[PDB]
Amino acid sequence: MTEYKLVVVGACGVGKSALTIQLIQNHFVDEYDPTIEDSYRKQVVIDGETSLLDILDTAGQEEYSAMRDQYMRTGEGFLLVFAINNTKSFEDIHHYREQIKRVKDSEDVPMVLVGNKSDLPSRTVDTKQAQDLARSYGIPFIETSAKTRQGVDDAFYTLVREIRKHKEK
Numbered sequence: 001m002t003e004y005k006l007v008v009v010g011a012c013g014v015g016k017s018a019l020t021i022q023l024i025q026n027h028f029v030d031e032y033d034p035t036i037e038d039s040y041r042k043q044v045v046i047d048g049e050t051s052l053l054d055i056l057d058t059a060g061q062e063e064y065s066a067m068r069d070q071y072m073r074t075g076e077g078f079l080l081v082f083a084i085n086n087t088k089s090f091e092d093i094h095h096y097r098e099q100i101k102r103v104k105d106s107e108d109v110p111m112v113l114v115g116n117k118s119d120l121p122s123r124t125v126d127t128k129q130a131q132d133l134a135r136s137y138g139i140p141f142i143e144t145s146a147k148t149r150q151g152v153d154d155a156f157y158t159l160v161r162e163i164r165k166h167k168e169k
């Protein structure tokens with residue numbers, strides 16, 4: 001089977017860990033230690049084809065690291081996560097994409113825009129803004145809630161679809 005390195009990126013508190021733990025362990029974690037950066041394995045069937053996923057849940061400090069760069073370069077696809085009640089995290093999306101392209105020689109890197117915390121009524125980022133941003137980048141946009149599990153499989157599955165499309169090229 002094919003094996004892909006996925007990387008979950010985005011600002012502190014957007015739900016990177018909650019999304020990943022939901023996918024792997026099927027429960028919602030409310031106070032996940034923000035210093036733990038770990039990877040998880042999962043075998044999945046998507047569009048009738050099995051892939052092994054190696055998923056890195058990023059953390060660390062707001063700092064440049066040449067070693068982090070090295071790890072990020074090995075990623076084959078990225079989830080760009082923001083929270084719909086956090087305008088800063090949405091503004092940050094552009095900068096995460098800039099860093100991904102930087103470390104991967106400006107390749108047309110497989111990416112999915114993820115609007116997490118879609119269960120909350122406290123929205124500050126309009127869906128149209130997110131759709132327009134994904135459109136400009138030529139990437140899918142998926143709305144998720146790690147809390148309710150809405151769209152969690154979809155977000156990761158869609159990223160695998162993007163990697164598959166890219167590796168045909």
Ligand SMILES: *CCC(=O)N1CCN(c2nc(=O)n(-c3ccccc3C(C)C)c3cc(-c4c(O)cccc4F)c(Cl)cc23)CC1
Pocket residue numbers: 009010011012013016034035058059060061062063064065068069072092095096097099100103
């Ligand atoms: C609360 C802990 C947590 O979740 N995080 C999220 C990831 N963190 C983080 N912060 C940050 O400022 N950057 C960054 C560094 C240099 C320039 C621009 C940025 C942001 C605004 C895009 C990163 C950058 C990355 C990163 C790197 O370094 C290379 C390639 C891709 C990439 F996403 C990462 Cl993984 C995490 C950053 C703070 C703690």
Ligand SMILES: Nc1nc2c(ncn2[C@@H]2O[C@H](COP(=O)(O)OP(=O)(O)O)[C@@H](O)[C@H]2O)c(=O)[nH]1
Pocket residue numbers: 010011012013014015016017018019029030031032033034116117118119120144145146147148
């Ligand atoms: N209401 C709601 N809260 C969430 C969701 N995802 C994460 N959270 C909460 O937001 C906080 C940060 O989540 P976490 O996964 O630790 O964010 P990370 O710093 O990006 O890894 C935690 O208190 C989570 O319980 C969601 O989809 N909906």
Ligand SMILES: [Ca+2]
Pocket residue numbers: 016017018032033034035036058059
């Ligand atoms: Ca985390």
Ligand SMILES: [Ca+2]
Pocket residue numbers: 061063
């Ligand atoms: Ca440091």
